[PDB]
């Protein structure tokens, strides 16, 4: 977790207590305070607890029990006062003279595990030697807990020596507060929240400066790499046998770091305390002058994990005359790695470019404790303070000699002031943003707490943020500091008056109407996924040049075989249809209103446009034109029974005309007229497929799916489908003014014979064109083929309703209009009056 920060409460209270003695707070209160000022507390983990006899022990003899498969040993352990116990253990990460934690019978471990006496193998097992996990202390169960030599004497209480009354806070730090990735930063934040005096654990009052009587190692720095500060300090004559004390290993463990040798333990400890990453180079392994430069085109390097990594010309690294020493701020090489062989180390304190580390650690896939903090900026003013804190602590543990020499590169034009530029802000600006009249001097006081120098001048404050807050750059940044410390709960609730709005657009309103209309007719809306099913267009048998195959593709899809974004809504609808059918819901009508993604030859990347200004109109047009077309579609699919069976009858199966009607439901909801014309267009059935036109513009297709597609795709037989482009349907706002004549009507029927492939709509249009204004209604009610008609023919019978606007229409006037209708049908479609 690249934003996580784990630390124990006791260590946090210690740093806070230096400037505020006797400060102690319940874990639950601390949790609320951290939340109030802007830190997410993911988890609060109390250590332990243990009840009963849990005592530090000393392993006397290890009579290994041979013969078994796994290594099993019987141990004699002193529980103090030389009253010996016999225990059986399976771990093998300890020898004679080690300190361990034993759990005698009667004790109860976390959680609900009471230790009793048992006969394990061939000996009696009184208690058990515990691991850090069994004690709810650490996370390692591969080996038992070995306290360092001299951590306590046998007989001491285990709960006391292990500090099982402590509590561990796990926090998620926002990427703008990298200074909180340390005990220094969070302690400072608590001091602000509780109005306490704060003693910076990195100030020279707390880390007395070590002597600088010369340069510590040759160093050349390419200034283009982004390095801001590079420091070095050697330690000579360390004891390779000595280990880190218990208080240091315990704090390392509670923070999620496992101890190794003291040279590496102190670098990880000072990084956790002060926030400045620290690396230990074996001074005896460094051969020549150290150089900070970019990497060559193919220069590779192995890390201290043994894996070689292909570097890039943008990677910053440190290298001597032999080989590369480290990838700067990412991970060190195995060359200069400190070992139990090492005696003289060279500590490095470096400040790397954040963007450069972020690039390299992501391209190489290794986020480290160092890389996380460099990604979020590290306080460049404390490099030597953390270097002297590290060297002084290492000799105090490894019994060495702190070499009084130091190299400190501060830039080609050297830098002695690390503070960001000052900021001008009106004193009441926080009050205006908060909507709260803060008491006099609140802004100046809060901004001093976070570490900024504040100067007044009438109504204007000049704020110079501290070096550990590069995020404080504008007045708005300072406003956040004031408001979050005062607490956002004091901000009142004032409903702003908005201007008179205009409501929903015509297109927003139409999308609602279409949805209401399809739902009321029995369709069920689905949210359609934009990731096409694998191979869908091959299942459809589309040609290779079909426009629907030109898809936008995602580089990192969740399913590797589904990277294509949909150009049509039907595959997602057909997938939801198959899901319903396979679950026993076989009579299904589904629809969706959603955009598709259709790239063109103009679809392309656009390089970064400067964000310190509004983009020009051409830049806006570049951006818009570079994106794939994303029009709004409406689509629907149907399978099984369109109408269910019931006491009325056996129901009606889905047919193509149900898809044509969904088209008409959409057209009515859109208040447009449509025409359906025969068409051939996969995946539709070529004899049961209409193309839909508004005026002379194509807007989509409807009908029954192709039987070959249905079989290849595992769809229900007879599945039908509709897809229309809503963006191609023009918005209409008609103002009807109907003529409503109250005079009686005349009803007549006409039967017309035409060729069998003449569309019935074309005949009805011809009948209407000739009948004229007296025709009020025409409805087809019979389509007949038979031997009395002849082959290749069909008979259509229309019911006609005639009416006049000013008179009682006579049958002769109606028959004359009917005769003109028949004549028009004769001339336009070859209709022959039925005889």
């Amino acid at each position: 977790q690249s934003n996580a920060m784990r630390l124990p409460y006791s260590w946090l209270r210690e740093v806070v207590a230096v400037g505020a003695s006797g400060w102690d707070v319940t874990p639950g209160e601390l949790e609320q305070t951290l939340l109030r000022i802007g830190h997410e507390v993911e988890e609060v983990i109390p250590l332990g607890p243990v009840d009963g006899p849990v005592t530090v022990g000393r392993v006397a003899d290890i009579e290994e029990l041979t013969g078994y498969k796994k290594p099993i040993r019987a141990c004699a352990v002193d529980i103090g006062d030389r009253q010996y116990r016999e225990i059986i253990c399976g771990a093998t990460n300890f020898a004679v003279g080690d300190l361990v934690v034993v759990a005698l019978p009667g004790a109860t471990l976390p959680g609900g595990f009471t230790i009793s006496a048992r006969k394990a193998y061939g000996r009696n097992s009184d208690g058990m030697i515990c691991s850090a996990a069994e004690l709810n202390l650490g996370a390692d169960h591969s080996g038992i807990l070995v306290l360092p030599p001299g951590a306590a004497e046998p007989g001491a209480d285990g709960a006391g020596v292990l500090g099982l009354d402590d509590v561990v806070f796990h926090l998620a730090i926002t990427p703008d507060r990298g200074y909180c990735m340390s005990v220094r930063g969070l302690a400072r934040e608590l001091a602000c929240a509780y109005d306490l005096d704060f003693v910076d654990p990195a100030s020279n009052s707390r880390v007395p400066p070590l002597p600088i009587e010369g340069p510590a190692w040759p160093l050349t720095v390419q200034p283009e790499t982004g390095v801001r500060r590079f420091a070095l300090r050697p330690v000579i004559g360390i004891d390779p046998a000595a280990v880190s004390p218990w208080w240091l290993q315990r704090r390392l463990l509670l923070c999620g770091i496992r101890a190794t040798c003291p040279a590496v333990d102190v670098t990880n400890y000072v990084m956790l305390e002060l926030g400045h990453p620290m690396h230990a180079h074996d001074r005896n392994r460094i051969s020549g002058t150290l150089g900070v430069r970019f990497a060559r085109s193919g220069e590779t390097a192995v890390t201290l994990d043994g894996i070689e990594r292909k570097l890039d010309t943008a990677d910053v690294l440190i290298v001597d005359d032999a080989a590369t020493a480290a990838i700067g701020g990412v991970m060190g090489a195995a060359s200069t790695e400190v070992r139990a062989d090492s005696t003289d180390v060279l500590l490095e304190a470096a400040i790397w470019d954040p963007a450069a580390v972020s690039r390299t650690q992501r391209r190489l896939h290794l986020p480290s404790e160092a890389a996380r903090r460099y990604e979020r900026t590290v306080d460049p003013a404390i490099s030597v303070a953390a270097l002297d804190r590290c060297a002084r602590l290492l000799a105090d543990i490894a019994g060495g000699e702190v070499s009084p020499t130091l190299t400190d590169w501060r830039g080609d034009p050297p830098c002695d002031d690390w503070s960001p530029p000052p900021i001008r802000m009106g004193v009441d600006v926080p009050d205006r943003i908060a909507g709260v009249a803060y008491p006099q001097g609140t802004t100046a006081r809060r901004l001093a707490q976070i570490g900024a120098v504040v100067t007044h001048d009438g109504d204007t404050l000049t704020v110079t943020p501290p070096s550990w807050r590069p995020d404080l750059r504008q007045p708005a940044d300072l406003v956040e500091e004031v408001l979050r410390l005062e607490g956002l709960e004091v901000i009142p609730s004032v409903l702003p008056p908005a201007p008179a709005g205009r409501g929903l657009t015509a297109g927003q309103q139409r999308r609602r109407t279409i949805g209401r209309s399809l739902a009321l007719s029995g369709y069920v809306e689905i949210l359609p996924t934009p990731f096409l099913p694998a191979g869908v267009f091959d299942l459809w048998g589309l040609e290779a040049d079909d426009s629907r195959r030109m898809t936008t593709r995602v580089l990192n899809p969740l399913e590797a075989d589904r990277p294509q974004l949909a150009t049509t809504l039907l595959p997602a609808l057909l997938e939801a249809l198959v899901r319903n059918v396979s679950r026993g819901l076989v009579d299904v009508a589904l629809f969706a209103i959603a955009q598709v993604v259709q790239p063109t030859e103009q679809t392309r990347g656009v390089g970064l446009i400067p964000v310190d200004r509004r983009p020009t109109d051409d830049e806006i047009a570049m951006l818009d034109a570079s994106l794939p077309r994303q029009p709004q579609h409406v689509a629907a699919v149907l399978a099984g029974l369109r109408e269910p069976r019931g006491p009325w009858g056996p129901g009606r199966p889905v047919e193509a005309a149900d898809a044509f009607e969904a088209v008409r439901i959409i057209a009515r909801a859109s208040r447009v007229d449509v025409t359906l014309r025969p068409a051939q267009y996969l995946p539709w059935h070529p004899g049961r497929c209409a193309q839909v036109f508004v005026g002379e513009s194509s807007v989509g297709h409807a009908g029954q799916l192709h039987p070959a597609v249905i079989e290849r795709s595992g769809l229900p037989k007879g599945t039908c489908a509709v897809e229309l482009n809503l963006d191609a349907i023009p918005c209409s706002a008609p103002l009807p003014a109907p003529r409503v004549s109250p005079y009686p009507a005349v009803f007549q029927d006409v039967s017309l014979v035409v060729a069998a492939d003449i569309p019935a709509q074309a005949v009805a249009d011809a009948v209407r064109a000739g009948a004229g204004d007296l025709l009020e209604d025409i409805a087809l009610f019979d389509v007949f083929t038979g031997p009395q008609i002849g082959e290749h023919r069909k008979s259509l019978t229309f019911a006609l309703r005639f009416r006049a606007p000013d008179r009682t229409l006579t049958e002769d006037d109606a028959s004359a209009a009917r005769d003109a209708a028949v004549q028009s049908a004769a001339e336009r479609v070859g209709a022959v009056l039925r005889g």
């Binding site: 690249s2 956040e480 709005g501 990347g605």
Partner: protein, 242 residues
């Protein structure tokens, strides 16, 4: 006897929740703005004051579009509609936007890679955090009833400063506790600058909430899978939606 020869259908519950949210803000004089799902990195990140080569951007759960240098993506949030709206409209601006958003999260009971958000944006003279709170409270009261309360606590987004997370409280919940609802803040002056607006004359606030999350804790939907898989048994109990 049963009489329904044409069974009722159903609009989708998330769509209907979106319609209720839209109507809530239109009734307050606001308007509804729109934006595409495939978006430029310019509007998804850069104009929203996201740093380049920085964890605030690189550790977003982003679907990137081929080719490698396309700088195209499936938008990770509806906040690019802020940029498009400020470029297209004259001030003052009071808008919401409701649309689909995409993150690289596996589908489980509480996550879905495809979800919906409602974005809110208000840029005018004299707008403050208190105006943000008032809108959030009206929004909460309309979606959760007259007992609804909101609370804000500091947080971070590149496009706001100050930033906060919004919790909501309503009765007959769980029966009542704070639930995470979304994020908000004052519009960053760098966002106004990138749209040609003078941060010395105009200020603004914005917010954003996920609709599937809202529907999950408001209705007590255990499995987010049911909201996205298209089973008719999930939608029909919500009714036609007309």
């Amino acid at each position: 006897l049963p009489s329904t020869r044409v069974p009722a259908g159903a609009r989708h519950p998330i769509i209907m929740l979106a319609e209720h949210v839209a109507d809530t803000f239109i009734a307050m004089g606001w308007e509804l703005a729109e934006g595409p799902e495939v978006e430029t990195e310019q509007f998804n990140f850069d104009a929203l004051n996201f740093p380049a080569d920085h964890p605030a951007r690189g550790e977003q759960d982003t679907f990137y579009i081929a080719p490698e240098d396309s700088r195209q993506l499936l938008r990770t949030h509806t906040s690019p509609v802020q940029i498009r709206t400020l470029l297209a409209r004259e001030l003052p601006v009071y808008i919401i936007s409701i649309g689909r958003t995409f993150r690289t999260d596996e589908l489980d009971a509480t996550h879905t890679p495809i979800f919906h958000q409602v974005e809110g944006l208000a840029v005018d003279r004299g707008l403050s955090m208190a105006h943000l709170r008032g809108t959030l409270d009206a929004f909460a009261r309309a979606e959760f009833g007259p007992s609804a309360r909101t609370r804000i606590r500091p947080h971070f987004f590149p496009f706001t400063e100050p930033s906060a997370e919004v919790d909501v409280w309503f009765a007959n919940k769980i029966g009542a506790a704070w639930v995470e609802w979304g994020g908000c803040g004052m519009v960053h002056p760098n966002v106004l600058r990138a749209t040609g607006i003078d941060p010395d004359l105009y200020s603004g606030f914005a917010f954003g909430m996920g609709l599937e999350r809202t529907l999950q804790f408001r209705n007590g939907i255990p499995d987010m899978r049911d909201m996205v898989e298209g089973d008719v048994r999930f939608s029909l109990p919500f009714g036609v939606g007309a």
